Amino acid sequence: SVSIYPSSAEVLKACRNNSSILLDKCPPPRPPSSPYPPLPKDKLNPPTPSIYLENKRDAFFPPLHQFCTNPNNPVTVIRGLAGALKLDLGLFSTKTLVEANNEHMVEVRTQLLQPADENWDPTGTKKIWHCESNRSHTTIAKYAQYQASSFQESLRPFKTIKFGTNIDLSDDKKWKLQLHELTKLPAFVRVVSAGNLLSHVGHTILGMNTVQLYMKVPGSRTPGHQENNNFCSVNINIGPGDCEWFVVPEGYWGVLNDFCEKNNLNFLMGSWWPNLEDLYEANVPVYRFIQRPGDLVWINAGTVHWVQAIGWCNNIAWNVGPLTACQYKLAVERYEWNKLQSVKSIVPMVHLSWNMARNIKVSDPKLFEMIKYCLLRTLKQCQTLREALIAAGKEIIWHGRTKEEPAHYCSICEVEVFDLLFVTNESNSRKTYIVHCQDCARKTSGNLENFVVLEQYKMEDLMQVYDQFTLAPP
Numbered sequence: 118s119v120s121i122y123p124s125s126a127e128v129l130k131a132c133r134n135n136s137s138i139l140l141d142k143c144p145p146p147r148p149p150s151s152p153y154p155p156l157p158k159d160k161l162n163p164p165t166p167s168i169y170l171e172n173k174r175d176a177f178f179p180p181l182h183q184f185c186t187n188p189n190n191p192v193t194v195i196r197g198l199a200g201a202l203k204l205d206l207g208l209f210s211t212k213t214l215v216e217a218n219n220e221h222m223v224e225v226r227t228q229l230l231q232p233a234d235e236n237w238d239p240t241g242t243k244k245i246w247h248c249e250s251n252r253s254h255t256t257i258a259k260y261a262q263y264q265a266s267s268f269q270e271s272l273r274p275f276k277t278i279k280f281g282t283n284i285d286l287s288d289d290k291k292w293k294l295q296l297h298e299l300t301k302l303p304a305f306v307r308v309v310s311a312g313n314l315l316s317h318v319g320h321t322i323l324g325m326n327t328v329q330l331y332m333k334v335p336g337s338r339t340p341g342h343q344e345n346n347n348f349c350s351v352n353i354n355i356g357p358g359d360c361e362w363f364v365v366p367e368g369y370w371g372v373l374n375d376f377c378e379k380n381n382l383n384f385l386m387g388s389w390w391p392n393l394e395d396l397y398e399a400n401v402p403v404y405r406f407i408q409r410p411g412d413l414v415w416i417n418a419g420t421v422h423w424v425q426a427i428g429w430c431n432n433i434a435w436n437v438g439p440l441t442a443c444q445y446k447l448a449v450e451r452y453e454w455n456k457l458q459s460v461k462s463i464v465p466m467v468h469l470s471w472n473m474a475r476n477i478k479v480s481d482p483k484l485f486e487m488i489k490y491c492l493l494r495t496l497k498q499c500q501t502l503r504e505a506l507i508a509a510g511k512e513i514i515w516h517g518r519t520k521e522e523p524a525h526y527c528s529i530c531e532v533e534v535f536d537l538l539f540v541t542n543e544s545n546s547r548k549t550y551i552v553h554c555q556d557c558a559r560k561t562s563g564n565l566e567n568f569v570v571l572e573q574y575k576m577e578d579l580m581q582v583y584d585q586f587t588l589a590p591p
């Protein structure tokens with residue numbers, strides 16, 4: 118086993134400046150061109166990779182994990198999952214939810230009921246990409262009343278509907294039985310696991326390493342997106358109705374980004390529902406399937422997808438990050454692309470990478486090299502910044518952090534800010550601690566007159582974590 122990275126002492130000595138240790142100019146991220154080889158028309162409506170579970174033991178069959186994580190499978194539907202594990206989906210019924218926490222908050226998206234797989238402008242004149250979805254907030258009790266009455270009404274120029282989304286099931290004291298039911302899942306889809314990157318973040322990232330619930334009426338749509346930082350997604354349909362999923366492989370996200378732009382929409386932050394006719398003509402394959410109650414949908418890393426309720430149903434969902442080179446690579450790429458687009462990375466990949474280095478014995482050479490490389494780039498960036506401040510006579514205040522303390526982001530550009538926080542004098546005194554990155558601070562004060570610099574980690578500490586992160590035996 119050959120170490121290809123310099124020691125932390127070597128990195129530090131290099132910053133104190135001769136020959137370079139590495140090329141810090143880095144190729145900047147860009148959306149990929151349409152995959153090669155191109156696909157013919159007869160391969161643009163592929164069947165969905167499926168797993169048909171019958172017994173509890175089937176769910177824990179080891180090859181399951183590998184089938185779902187296989188890059189060639191953009192999505193996997195696991196049929197009969199709830200039944201095989203005898204999960205009580207009743208714990209997630211609207212009735213049970215109302216009884217548990219009837220005043221709990223629900224984000225509401227008001228939309229137009231659209232026909233089938235299509236999206237039309239509000240006048241019904243033509244198909245468009247923009248998906249109208251306006252935000253409000255209500256309680257579970259009040260949305261439950263609406264969901265129930267919507268259904269009763271059905272037993273008896275688009276109509277307006279409301280979609281209960283992003284309902285926060287993070288509090289184990291309000292949702293104890295609900296969250297406990299999910300510990301029955303196999304490790305690779307659990308909300309918390311040693312093999313889940315998001316379990317190593319060290320703090321709560323709502324909806325990713327905590328459970329989110331959806332309450333739906335027919336037509337309730339989640340428009341096109343990739344997960345935050347391209348993390349895999351897990352979704353179980355509670356029922357009683359079905360959901361319909363539309364899926365495009367990760368490699369085509371550049372093509373979809375271009376469609377968005379051509380329709381004057383933002384790919385990452387915009388609200389869009391793809392025109393299937395447009396995709397077909399651009400030779401973009403679409404996986405399309407129905408998720409029944411009890412079925413689990415696994416969305417692979419960076420898979421582009423959008424969803425609509427066909428019936429009345431609830432869903433629960435969260436993210437997982439398999440401990441693989443593929444997942445880490447995609448997460449870092451989106452992290453870098455986000456920076457270029459001034460879009461917030463909900464997963465703080467630097468904070469996480471350093472936690473992975475503290476906690477995880479990485480045995481796979483490719484994944485190990487990616488992480489250690491990240492540690493090298495950021496260790497170097499931190500010491501470079503520290504040396505510049507010291508040379509400019511700017512002092513560094515020890516601030517430290519609590520172990521469960523979240524990563525901080527710039528209040529201006531929303532970039533992750535690691536180890537050295539810039540806070541205005543007023544903000545420091547009032548302990549409001551409004552963080553800025555270096556660049557955004559300097560824009561308002563060239564010499565940082567109006568700012569203090571808080572240090573969260575000892576350099577000795579980072580240096581040790583770096584040196585102690587070594588390829589683990591298989």
Ligand SMILES: O=C(O)CNC(=O)C(=O)O
Pocket residue numbers: 331338339350351352416424425432434435
């Ligand atoms: O259930 C929905 O409407 C949307 N769900 C997802 O995007 C997901 O689970 O990844």
Ligand SMILES: [Cl-]
Pocket residue numbers: 252253
């Ligand atoms: Cl709003």
Ligand code: NI
Pocket residue numbers: none
């Ligand atoms: Ni138990």
Ligand code: NI
Pocket residue numbers: 342343344350416422
């Ligand atoms: Ni999703």
Ligand code: NI
Pocket residue numbers: 516517518519
């Ligand atoms: Ni603090």
Ligand SMILES: [Zn+2]
Pocket residue numbers: 527528529530531532553554555556557558
């Ligand atoms: Zn900034």
